[PDB]
Amino acid sequence: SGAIYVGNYRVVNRHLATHNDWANLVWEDSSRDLLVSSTTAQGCDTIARCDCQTGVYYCSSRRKHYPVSFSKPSLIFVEASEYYPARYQSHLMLAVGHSEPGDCGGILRCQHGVVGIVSTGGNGLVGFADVRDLLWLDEE
């Protein structure tokens, strides 16, 4: 589990969104595994606006933050899980690292701020849903 709290937005994995998230929906995209809902309080996270390929992510199944090198956001084939059939997921970045299903939501960050959240995993891989192209998170 986990979310990004920027401005009056809450960014979560679409597959982990709650009823309150769907009832206060701003935007969702199943191909990216992302959903954004509105919040009453302002958040403290800052979004990175950069092309970094190195950063650090939080792994809840290890209680640890790990430094990683990650690929550029792309269209990647992801195996079937409890939440999606086997399919192509867009705006996804891969790194070598530990991930279990419940690790979804952990933040990946670089020197500029939040880059994305854990979305996929398996066999020493971890996938991150990028948010750096969502410029509207910084306004309204």
Ligand SMILES: Cn1nc(CC(=O)N2CC(C(N)=O)C2)c2ccccc21
């Ligand atoms: C974080 N992660 N995820 C999965 C499968 C899963 O629940 N999916 C893949 C997610 C998606 N965005 O399509 C939903 C896994 C399987 C072993 C290890 C780590 C893992």
Ligand SMILES: [Zn+2]
């Ligand atoms: Zn950066």
